[PDB]
Enzyme design. Structure first.
Site, PDB file in Angstrom:
ATOM      1  N   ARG A   8       0.829  -1.197   0.000  1.00  0.00           N
ATOM      2  CA  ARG A   8       0.000   0.000   0.000  1.00  0.00           C
ATOM      3  C   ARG A   8       0.863   1.246   0.000  1.00  0.00           C
ATOM      4  NH1 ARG A   8      -2.368   2.252   4.928  1.00  0.00           N
ATOM      5  NH2 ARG A   8      -1.360   4.108   4.056  1.00  0.00           N
ATOM      6  N   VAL A   9       0.345   2.329  -0.564  1.00  0.00           N
ATOM      7  CA  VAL A   9       1.123   3.540  -0.700  1.00  0.00           C
ATOM      8  C   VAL A   9       0.250   4.796  -0.547  1.00  0.00           C
ATOM      9  CG1 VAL A   9       0.975   3.069  -3.147  1.00  0.00           C
ATOM     10  CG2 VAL A   9       2.544   4.820  -2.315  1.00  0.00           C
ATOM     11  N   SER A  10       0.802   5.844   0.057  1.00  0.00           N
ATOM     12  CA  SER A  10       0.039   7.073   0.310  1.00  0.00           C
ATOM     13  C   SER A  10       0.694   8.387  -0.142  1.00  0.00           C
ATOM     14  CB  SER A  10      -0.343   7.165   1.784  1.00  0.00           C
ATOM     15  OG  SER A  10       0.758   6.838   2.618  1.00  0.00           O
ATOM     16  N   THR A  11       1.967   8.353  -0.538  1.00  0.00           N
ATOM     17  CA  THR A  11       2.660   9.568  -0.994  1.00  0.00           C
ATOM     18  C   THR A  11       3.518   9.341  -2.245  1.00  0.00           C
ATOM     19  OG1 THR A  11       2.773  10.156   1.368  1.00  0.00           O
ATOM     20  CG2 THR A  11       3.821  11.669  -0.172  1.00  0.00           C
ATOM     21  N   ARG A  68       0.925  -0.400   7.230  1.00  0.00           N
ATOM     22  CA  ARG A  68       0.410  -0.632   5.908  1.00  0.00           C
ATOM     23  C   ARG A  68      -0.989  -1.158   6.021  1.00  0.00           C
ATOM     24  NH1 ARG A  68       1.777   3.094   3.581  1.00  0.00           N
ATOM     25  NH2 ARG A  68       3.525   3.798   4.886  1.00  0.00           N
TER      26      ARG A  68
END
Lengths: 183, 182, 182, 183
Positions: A8-11, A68
DNA sequence: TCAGTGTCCGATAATTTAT
DNA sequence: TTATCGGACACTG
DNA sequence: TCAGTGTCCGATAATTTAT
DNA sequence: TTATCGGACACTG
DNA sequence: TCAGTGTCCGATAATTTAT
DNA sequence: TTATCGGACACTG
DNA sequence: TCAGTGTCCGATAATTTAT
DNA sequence: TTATCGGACACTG
């Protein structure tokens, strides 16, 4: 033993790749890895929503770090509780701990709890940061690209907007805006 | 506005110690709320209600951690809820409150440590069920009806809508005593 | 090579249950060391001895955390000593080991949580006695000597040595009963 | 409130200023701020030593983050034990808590306990790090400086070691070692 | 043989503050 | 967080 | 106005195993 | 857990 | 006046591995 | 982690 | 050889307060 | 926490 992955990724740091390699190094195959680029929306987590549909008693999901699986400790504990009843456990790669036992879930909880507090203390320091920089006189937001002295100096010269927007390469929406603001 | 909450799950229905402790802390009977597990799903209707009657600025009281929350999951959500609402919890014996960020953490931790130690006891209690189960210890309500008089009067010929009238037992139990004893 | 360790501090000298558990766990009686705290400064010789007789590879077994250690600092020390010496501890009921990195952390946390809970109980017991020296309650060992036979004998012209010989008591006490009954 | 400060540093990032700044900002006089920079030797924290000799009942020492005062958790718990039986208490700025109360100490302990764990986990990854590189081929250590093809070319020639170390600016120890090491 | 002006948003694009 | 983009409309003639 | 007989659960009540 | 208490049906002759 | 030679350290300096 | 300095010794001629 | 008299402790046993 | 035992002195004549 029926292994699964999750990343998962947010930036901007969309090293989703660095996560997926970590997953594959651990024996999870592409076949059953599930991905999520949290587009910043209320909760549009499709990947995960599809993961809990295929896992059945026996399976083991793998993730790289704690932060995550879940945004917040309250959400993440429910997830684990669901899975547990379902008969699936979670293994955390970097933290090297896992949900299969009891002192396991305990550590997990204790761990994300110290996380959340640290996360929140930072969040506050970041908002004050904006105040002692905002009132300081620092300018926020996209740098201005358009040569505005080239809009005034072209309209005060008689010519109409449609013309101005074509010769220069910019949207007509902008041209009029540039005018009404410079009073 | 101050509020109380007390709860009980076993024979030790000292709901009174809790309700008294809360009073000592300054909570008026007027706003103390009570639940007592009957062993049903989660008929904690007393709680359900208390969270209706709370507004921004209100403070709920509870004597110890394991009252409010059964499991840490359920517990954390309740606080997440109350918090959004603008309300806080102060635990008396544990001496901490959901007031601050560190507050919540310490709560979250202590319950997590509890749940854990509470689970180990459960599995120990259960393992012990088996070292006395196969040993030969009999489980259940102790028998009370004189079964050396039910079979002694039925084999004499007297009907089964008559023997329950002579003694003081239900007509369901006479047929159970006859059928089971083969 | 396995080793055991059990300890006791109160009337509940079920030091057996512990050594039963250590034998049920697979330690030979050869290797199960023992201590019993009289309540004096620090007289735990059994341990003193164990930590002299172990080599790299060995594992010490112990039944619960609160045995190896009174307080969390000591607790970590013991572990640290053993650690640099090639030995690790395994807590049974608790089901965790000083084997690994996470291992030690969990131990540490738990004792810390326990210690807090422990110092709160101490201050409660301590208020408990204080606030019960207001009503009764009579503290101390229960009186045994017939004091109405001492005064009754001393006012009769008799002298303290006679009274100590006759009643089988100490001359120390003869005077003390008198000088504390005016 | 006899206020005191304490700052410490262990790597190239000798931003001792940031710490001393934080402390002054928090309200300590330079008059009572104390400083230590470890050199990697056994233990030479002369600064702390000094400060714990000068505090009394009522005093409060301040420190910016946990991992400054204490290295390992025992050492941490011991300082506090000392300080506690003295009538002083420590306040940690960034972690927002203090040895002030019973619960206080507990939290401090729990937190450093986590620190030390995640710190060791990092350290073992740094060390498996030099392995996926040690056996990968990489050569560790100081770069070789003495021209060796002039030490051997000068020795088979016949000349003594004493004359070899005087011509070239090297110590006679290094002559023999170079020779014995390459055959 | 329909066509040009100007207004008003929601998307989309780059930018700052912090570990 | 502020800048521009691409369109949808509602007017005029 | 059967009028009794026999089985088949859903409630309760008294118990056991353990910190 | 196991034992009793009250019923609800489904059949009798 | 040895006076030259060869060994075996403890101290230092220069380097690499990583969040 | 390896590369060099300075010495401290224990021998020879 | 006194031989008797009273006072003042330190160690332990029993017993209280609470989980 | 207190109650008691065995003593160690200090007094006593």
């Amino acid at each position: 033993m029926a292994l699964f992955g999750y990343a998962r990724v947010s930036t901007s740091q969309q090293s989703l790749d660095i996560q997926v390699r970590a997953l594959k190094d651990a024996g999870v195959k592409a076949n059953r890895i599930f991905t999520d680029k949290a587009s910043g929306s209320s909760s549009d987590r499709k990947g995960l929503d599809l993961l809990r549909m295929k896992v059945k008693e026996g399976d083991v999901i793998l993730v790289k770090k704690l932060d995550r699986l879940g945004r917040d400790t309250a959400d993440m504990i429910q997830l684990i509780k669901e899975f547990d009843a379902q008969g699936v456990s979670i293994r955390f790669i970097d933290d090297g701990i896992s949900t299969d036992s009891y002192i396991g879930k305990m550590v997990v909880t204790i761990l994300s709890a110290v996380a959340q507090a640290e996360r929140q203390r930072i969040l506050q320091r970041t908002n004050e940061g904006r105040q002692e920089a905002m009132a300081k006189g620092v300018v926020f937001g996209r740098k201005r690209k358009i040569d505005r002295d080239a809009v005034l100096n072209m309209w005060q010269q008689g010519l109409g907007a449609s013309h101005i927007s074509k010769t220069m390469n910019i949207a007509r929406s902008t041209v009029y805006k540039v005018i009404n603001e410079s009073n």
